Design a protein around this motif. Structure first.
Motif, PDB file in Angstrom:
ATOM      1  N   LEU A  25       0.925  -1.232  -0.108  1.00 45.69           N
ATOM      2  CA  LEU A  25      -0.033   0.105   0.010  1.00 45.69           C
ATOM      3  C   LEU A  25       0.861   1.309  -0.118  1.00 45.69           C
ATOM      4  CD1 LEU A  25      -2.693  -0.736   2.661  1.00 45.69           C
ATOM      5  CD2 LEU A  25      -2.630  -1.444   0.259  1.00 45.69           C
ATOM      6  N   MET A  26       2.180   1.153   0.544  1.00 41.22           N
ATOM      7  CA  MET A  26       3.073   2.059   0.312  1.00 41.22           C
ATOM      8  C   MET A  26       3.980   1.874  -0.462  1.00 41.22           C
ATOM      9  SD  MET A  26       3.946   2.913   4.438  1.00 41.22           S
ATOM     10  CE  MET A  26       3.045   4.319   5.303  1.00 41.22           C
ATOM     11  N   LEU A  31       7.943   5.686   8.156  1.00 44.01           N
ATOM     12  CA  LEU A  31       7.303   7.208   8.267  1.00 44.01           C
ATOM     13  C   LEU A  31       8.369   7.961   8.267  1.00 44.01           C
ATOM     14  CD1 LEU A  31       4.017   7.318   9.244  1.00 44.01           C
ATOM     15  CD2 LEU A  31       5.075   5.253   9.210  1.00 44.01           C
ATOM     16  N   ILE A  34       9.667  10.010   5.438  1.00 47.17           N
ATOM     17  CA  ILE A  34       8.575  10.886   4.877  1.00 47.17           C
ATOM     18  C   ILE A  34       8.002  11.925   5.580  1.00 47.17           C
ATOM     19  CG2 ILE A  34       6.132  10.537   3.855  1.00 47.17           C
ATOM     20  CD1 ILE A  34       6.883   7.651   3.577  1.00 47.17           C
ATOM     21  N   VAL A  35       7.587  11.579   6.875  1.00 46.69           N
ATOM     22  CA  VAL A  35       7.260  12.674   8.051  1.00 46.69           C
ATOM     23  C   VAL A  35       8.303  13.711   8.200  1.00 46.69           C
ATOM     24  CG1 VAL A  35       6.636  13.026  10.408  1.00 46.69           C
ATOM     25  CG2 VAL A  35       5.448  11.214   8.942  1.00 46.69           C
TER      26      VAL A  35
ATOM     27  N   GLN D   8       6.777  -3.804  13.591  1.00 44.22           N
ATOM     28  CA  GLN D   8       5.428  -4.324  13.477  1.00 44.22           C
ATOM     29  C   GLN D   8       5.602  -6.054  12.942  1.00 44.22           C
ATOM     30  OE1 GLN D   8       2.237  -2.128  12.041  1.00 44.22           O
ATOM     31  NE2 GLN D   8       2.483  -1.065  13.770  1.00 44.22           N
TER      32      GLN D   8
ATOM     33  N   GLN E  21      -4.171  -6.357  11.042  1.00 38.90           N
ATOM     34  CA  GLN E  21      -2.845  -6.634  11.386  1.00 38.90           C
ATOM     35  C   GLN E  21      -1.824  -6.577   9.983  1.00 38.90           C
ATOM     36  OE1 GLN E  21      -4.084  -7.529  14.578  1.00 38.90           O
ATOM     37  NE2 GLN E  21      -2.233  -6.367  15.170  1.00 38.90           N
ATOM     38  N   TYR E  24       1.418  -2.528   6.665  1.00 38.57           N
ATOM     39  CA  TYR E  24       1.400  -1.231   5.753  1.00 38.57           C
ATOM     40  C   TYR E  24       0.507  -0.577   5.915  1.00 38.57           C
ATOM     41  CZ  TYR E  24       5.557  -3.616   3.510  1.00 38.57           C
ATOM     42  OH  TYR E  24       6.787  -3.990   3.083  1.00 38.57           O
ATOM     43  N   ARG E  26      -1.221  -0.196   8.843  1.00 41.95           N
ATOM     44  CA  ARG E  26      -1.206   0.542  10.164  1.00 41.95           C
ATOM     45  C   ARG E  26      -0.365   1.806   9.907  1.00 41.95           C
ATOM     46  NH1 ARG E  26      -3.490  -1.402  14.437  1.00 41.95           N
ATOM     47  NH2 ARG E  26      -3.803  -3.481  14.686  1.00 41.95           N
ATOM     48  N   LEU E  27       0.673   1.708   9.371  1.00 45.35           N
ATOM     49  CA  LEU E  27       1.948   2.589   9.178  1.00 45.35           C
ATOM     50  C   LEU E  27       1.218   3.718   8.283  1.00 45.35           C
ATOM     51  CD1 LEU E  27       4.858   0.363   8.543  1.00 45.35           C
ATOM     52  CD2 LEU E  27       4.598   2.071  10.430  1.00 45.35           C
ATOM     53  N   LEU E  28       0.374   3.347   7.281  1.00 47.35           N
ATOM     54  CA  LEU E  28      -0.671   4.511   6.462  1.00 47.35           C
ATOM     55  C   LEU E  28      -1.379   5.361   7.329  1.00 47.35           C
ATOM     56  CD1 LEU E  28      -2.429   5.551   4.377  1.00 47.35           C
ATOM     57  CD2 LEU E  28      -0.259   4.386   2.980  1.00 47.35           C
ATOM     58  N   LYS E  30      -0.932   5.795  10.700  1.00 46.62           N
ATOM     59  CA  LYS E  30      -0.009   6.579  11.680  1.00 46.62           C
ATOM     60  C   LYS E  30       0.791   7.729  10.853  1.00 46.62           C
ATOM     61  CE  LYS E  30       1.894   2.968  14.666  1.00 46.62           C
ATOM     62  NZ  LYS E  30       3.221   2.437  15.220  1.00 46.62           N
ATOM     63  N   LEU E  31       0.837   7.572   9.384  1.00 49.82           N
ATOM     64  CA  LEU E  31       1.160   8.832   8.711  1.00 49.82           C
ATOM     65  C   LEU E  31      -0.205   9.723   8.752  1.00 49.82           C
ATOM     66  CD1 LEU E  31       2.363   8.721   4.966  1.00 49.82           C
ATOM     67  CD2 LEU E  31       1.836  10.827   6.512  1.00 49.82           C
ATOM     68  N   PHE E  34      -0.651  11.624  12.327  1.00 50.30           N
ATOM     69  CA  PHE E  34       0.007  12.628  12.304  1.00 50.30           C
ATOM     70  C   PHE E  34      -0.420  13.905  11.501  1.00 50.30           C
ATOM     71  CE2 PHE E  34       3.718  15.090  10.863  1.00 50.30           C
ATOM     72  CZ  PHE E  34       4.189  15.686  11.829  1.00 50.30           C
ATOM     73  N   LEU E  35      -0.751  13.672  10.429  1.00 49.54           N
ATOM     74  CA  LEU E  35      -0.980  14.500   9.374  1.00 49.54           C
ATOM     75  C   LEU E  35      -2.542  15.122   9.515  1.00 49.54           C
ATOM     76  CD1 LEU E  35       0.821  15.536   6.777  1.00 49.54           C
ATOM     77  CD2 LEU E  35      -0.763  14.174   5.674  1.00 49.54           C
ATOM     78  N   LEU E 101      -5.353   2.666  -3.150  1.00 48.85           N
ATOM     79  CA  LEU E 101      -4.671   1.661  -2.159  1.00 48.85           C
ATOM     80  C   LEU E 101      -4.106   0.740  -2.999  1.00 48.85           C
ATOM     81  CD1 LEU E 101      -7.409   1.604   0.676  1.00 48.85           C
ATOM     82  CD2 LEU E 101      -4.971   2.486   0.977  1.00 48.85           C
ATOM     83  N   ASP E 122       1.239   7.290   0.501  1.00 49.21           N
ATOM     84  CA  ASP E 122       2.285   7.593   0.907  1.00 49.21           C
ATOM     85  C   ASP E 122       3.225   8.900   0.054  1.00 49.21           C
ATOM     86  OD1 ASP E 122       3.539   5.529  -0.447  1.00 49.21           O
ATOM     87  OD2 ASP E 122       5.574   6.113   0.490  1.00 49.21           O
TER      88      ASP E 122
END
Lengths: 50, 145, 122, 122, 186
Positions: A25-26, A31, A34-35, D8, E21, E24, E26-28, E30-31, E34-35, E101, E122
């Motif tokens: 998906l990324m 992060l 990128i962040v 993770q 679970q 990827y 989950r990290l999407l 978290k970005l 924050f954003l 996605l 991302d």
RNA sequence: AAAGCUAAGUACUGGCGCGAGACCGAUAGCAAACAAGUACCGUGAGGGAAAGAUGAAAAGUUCUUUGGAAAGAGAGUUAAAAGUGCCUGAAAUUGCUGAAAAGGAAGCGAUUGGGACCUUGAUUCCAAGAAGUGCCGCCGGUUUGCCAUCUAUCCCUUUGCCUUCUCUCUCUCACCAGGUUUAGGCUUUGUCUUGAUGUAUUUCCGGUUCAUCUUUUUGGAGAGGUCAGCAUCAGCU
RNA sequence: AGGAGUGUUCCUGUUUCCGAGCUCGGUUUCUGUGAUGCUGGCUAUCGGUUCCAACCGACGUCUUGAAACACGGACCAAGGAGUCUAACAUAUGUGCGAGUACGGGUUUUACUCCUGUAUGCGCAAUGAAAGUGAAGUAGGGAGAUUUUGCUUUGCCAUUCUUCGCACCUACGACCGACCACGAUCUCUGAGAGAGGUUUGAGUUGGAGCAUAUCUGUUAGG
RNA sequence: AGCAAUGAGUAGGAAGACGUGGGGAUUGUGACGAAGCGUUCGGCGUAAGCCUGCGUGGAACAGUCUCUAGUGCAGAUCUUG
């Protein structure tokens, strides 16, 4: 292994017919790269407390 | 995953999840679809209307294949045969022929829209609308059997 | 650490009629009986556990000494409690030899880490 | 490569995790504290480091590190570097410098551990 | 001792976290939390919520529908918290610049050949943190086998709900209720 | 059609002979781990149990002594009596000893008390001495390479292709060729490493002895813990 | 209220008194946000596990109702009750997406790996059947854009006209059935065109398929 | 981490934990004494439960993340002893 699984980046993988390796998906896995680049961080507000 | 079922958590409570008053009796209300005519009628009207009675004339020894007829639409076709498209865009002479039987459909129906490229479509049956649309495209119609 | 220490209960919550019958063991079970007094909460009877009785977040699992116990098997596993020695007291395990205790106990004193068991097997 | 993606996977389970009650600790080399987080842990992070009494009868201290900007990351013989240090308050100043080159954020806890470490001999 | 309704303490109906679970995804999130928190733009707040949705709301938009929402607005990046499928009926695929996605491998071939960029979420953050000059889309939620069955319950007057029936054709739910000649129409 | 034969693939809680197990572990698993379809019940058709474990080795306790004998007591075998329905040996129940309590029940909750019984010059800091330990330094051998340079392919950017694959309603079409997907050997073009310079560093013995810190015993300076008293405030009263 | 520190530079308070028109500004000592201060006993108390005393409390199930003169329960151990298969359904996780998932070929041989041809369900519905078989608009709306109000480079507006996703609400067109027409043709038929207080589980640039688990319905001990 | 409000509950629903027999992976304990058993040596947790001193015992067992089930008893005029 390359003859089996193929190329990663649209055509298929030869031995497994019709198969391509999976795509996340990324693109970029993390992060923090990128962040904490300059394109995000200038537009972001100055933080706060309580 | 017996682990994840409600009986495990439910264990320790006397009713076992069925309730003290009414109880988990063996067969209240009959078995299967029994009682549809009388006691379970409200459920049948709504949920399952049209359940009781007979309508049409019966067919003895009905045989499928006699009636089978898989249908492609006009909006597809092109998916049927990508190189020819770049051939039949050009030239203004000859045309890309689509034997619809060979991909494995018999009838053609014009639900969709098609690009204006001269083409010939061969199918066992053509819907009335499909023919009008194909002709407009400058295409021709051919029957197989 | 060693902060103040306040307990709400010191009594256990014994199981209703554990006293009366020896088949009923003292380990707590909520009475689910329809007519039971304990669940219905009459006065002058066994108290039930609520979450009300929960001890402090700061002082949960805290020993009388001040520490939290973290129980330990080999000589290698005490090294983990090196920087957390002030915070953690080490309990040498159920199973361990006389030999391997005197390797553990001697290695613990090198690290200045407190061991709860002492004069453990002599 | 990514620190957060590797985390993770291995946050919940790995060879090192060692639990008792709410506590959990992490037995790897490349780990100040021996706590299981993204920051401190060896395995997951880019540029981890450890302060361990050196394994020569434990007479002296090691600073264990990786080459910076993850240079030889696929070659674990070549990646993992060591610097031996004598146990003193004087050679705190050399260690304090060497840590902040790799990681500025881990510097208070290095000073916490290095103080504890000197007090440690088999 | 308060006259309060439910003494609420009232919960919120919508989902409050990620259920996957998938690391990827989950990290999407978290970005994009924050954003969402920090940036203030309502684009990122919406994308955050739509990322946490279940599968039936992340429904596939075709390449041919994605043309016609994006028709007047050719320059703008076409965002879709969801999957993107190839339309086989579409002959000449328009080029666009899509973010989504997941693209099916036909639709990735069809866009990339037609001169047409194919982003992840991302990457969209690096270009467009605010969501400045974007187009949110989503595929229709109530358009599936299951959602034909919902509503007023098939044997009630002026419903258009499907009945749950084992098989099609006559002999199955076409008599008493469905004809006036068999008792009643309804 | 009113006459006939015919292997294979297929079935297989029986018989016969193999191989396994995310199965049961003596109230389980077959009814049956043992002289089990046995003992035993029924006129009969039929019904149908319970019952595994001393020890490595019987070395299964001779001998003196009390008694009619069974046994007991000394002594002895054993790593141990584990002492023959003998591994471990729970509870209900029973006897003794100790400890309490009890005027027609007792138990129990909450709160104290009483009686038995259990449990506790910190942390350090500065000198001197011994017992540890043996870093760097200095050699021989060995392995990493900060930084400044030069440069590879990753990747895309196609180029000049060529080879082998693969897909394709791409061509006269029967064969070659052409696109599509892979690999390879080559190409033009713009933050996961090679080769030289050696900030630094590990391992290895002989050292060359020295630092270091550890525990400890002798002084010197330094006391935490616990429970209270009075005082000053901040909140509520 | 309690591990240290420095100390008031800012800040509020109280105060020395200097000037401007009760109010504001400048200045000196003092106290707070930055306060724990002094002192004693014991090194056995404090505390803990047990049993006992005392004051106060304290009489499983069906049912409107059980301490009941309702029923079961002498004691202890061990054994004992929502399971497995199938057919669906919603929900949720994972894969691929207009697609999707009996044999043979390999092999260390019940695993694994690869694979040709079909079929399943889906991609089109509608009539008893013969058969026939699919143009958007408006309103509210997520978000973006252009601009108007407030502690300021950020805060919320509905201030704007610009496009308005999903979805709901209102109405259309097209397809099948039924009913009622029909210019004109190559006249058993085709069909310009134009309908209807009728009707479908229709449609409107397709979402499904396989798998995992829970919950429900049904069949089976 | 901070702030505020809230806290009864049968039938019933949902969430997070505790425990048992096996499978996979991993970290270990053990004839200088494993499992089990007993106990006023004790400790932790709101609780299910967990940890542990001493005694007996004599051969195997446990922690962690997952998979799986013949997985938790006071009652059934329950069954066997």
């Amino acid at each position: 292994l390359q003859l089996l699984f193929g190329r990663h980046t649209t055509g298929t993988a030869q031995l497994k017919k019709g198969y391509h390796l999976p795509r996340a998906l990324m693109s970029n896995a993390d992060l923090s790269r990128i962040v904490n680049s300059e394109e995000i961080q200038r537009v972001v507000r100055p933080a706060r407390v309580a | 995953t017996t682990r994840l079922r409600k009986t495990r958590k439910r264990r320790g409570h006397v009713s076992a999840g069925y309730g003290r008053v009414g109880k988990h009796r063996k067969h209240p209300g009959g078995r299967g679809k029994a009682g549809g005519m009388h006691h379970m009628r409200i459920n049948y009207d709504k949920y399952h209307p049209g359940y009781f009675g007979k309508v049409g004339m019966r067919h003895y020894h009905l045989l499928k294949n006699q009636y089978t007829c898989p249908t492609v639409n006009v909006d597809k076709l092109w998916s049927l045969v990508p190189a020819t498209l770049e051939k039949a865009e050009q030239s203004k002479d000859k045309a890309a022929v689509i034997d619809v039987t060979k991909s494995g459909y018999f009838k053609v129906l014009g639900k969709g829209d098609l690009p204006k490229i001269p083409v010939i479509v061969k199918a066992r049956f053509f819907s009335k609308i499909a023919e009008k649309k194909i002709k407009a495209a400058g295409g021709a119609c051919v029957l197989t059997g | 650490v060693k902060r103040s220490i306040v307990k709400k209960r010191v009594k256990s919550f014994p199981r209703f009629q554990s006293d009366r019958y020896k088949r009923v063991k003292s380990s707590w079970r909520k009475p689910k009986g329809i007519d039971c007094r304990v669940r219905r909460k009459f006065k002058g009877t066994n108290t039930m556990p609520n979450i009300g009785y929960g001890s402090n977040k700061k002082t949960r699992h805290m020993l009388p000494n001040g520490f939290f116990k973290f129980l330990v098997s080999s000589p290698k596993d005490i090294e983990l409690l090196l920087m957390h020695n002030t915070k953690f007291a080490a309990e040498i395990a159920h199973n361990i030899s006389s030999r391997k205790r005197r390797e553990i106990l001697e290695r613990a004193d090198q690290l200045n880490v407190l061991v709860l068991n002492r004069s453990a097997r002599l | 490569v990514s620190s957060e993606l590797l985390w993770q996977c291995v946050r919940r389970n790995h060879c090192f995790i060692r639990k008792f009650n709410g506590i959990t600790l992490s037995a790897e080399r490349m780990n100040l504290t021996n706590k299981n987080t993204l920051k401190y842990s060896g395995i997951a992070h880019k540029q981890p480091l450890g302060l361990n009494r050196h394994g020569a009868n434990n007479g002296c201290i090691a600073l264990v590190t990786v080459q910076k900007c993850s240079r030889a990351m696929r070659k674990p013989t070549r990646a993992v570097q060591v610097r031996k240090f004598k146990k003193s308050k004087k050679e705190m100043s050399k260690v304090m410098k060497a840590v902040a080159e790799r990681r500025p954020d881990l510097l208070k806890v290095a000073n916490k551990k290095m103080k504890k470490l000197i007090r440690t001999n088999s | 001792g308060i006259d309060l309704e439910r003494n609420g303490r009232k919960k919120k109906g919508g989902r409050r976290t990620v259920k996957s679970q998938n690391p990827y995804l989950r990290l999407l999130v978290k970005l994009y939390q924050f954003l969402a928190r920090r940036t203030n733009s309502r684009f990122n707040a919406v994308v955050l919520k739509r990322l946490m949705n279940p599968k039936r709301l992340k429904a596939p938009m075709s390449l041919s529908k994605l043309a016609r929402h994006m028709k007047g607005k050719e320059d703008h990046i076409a965002v879709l918290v969801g999957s993107v499928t190839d339309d086989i009926r579409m002959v000449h695929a328009p080029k666009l610049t899509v973010c989504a996605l997941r693209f099916s491998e036909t639709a990735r071939r069809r866009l990339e050949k037609a001169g047409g960029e194919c982003l992840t979420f991302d990457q969209l953050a690096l270009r467009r943190p605010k969501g400045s000059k974007c187009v949110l889309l989503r595929a229709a939620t109530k358009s599936r086998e299951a959602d034909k069955h919902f509503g007023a319950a098939p044997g009630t007057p002026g419903s258009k709900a499907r009945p749950y029936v084992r098989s099609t054709g006559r002999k199955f739910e076409k008599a008493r209720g469905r004809r006036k000649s068999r008792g009643y129409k309804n």
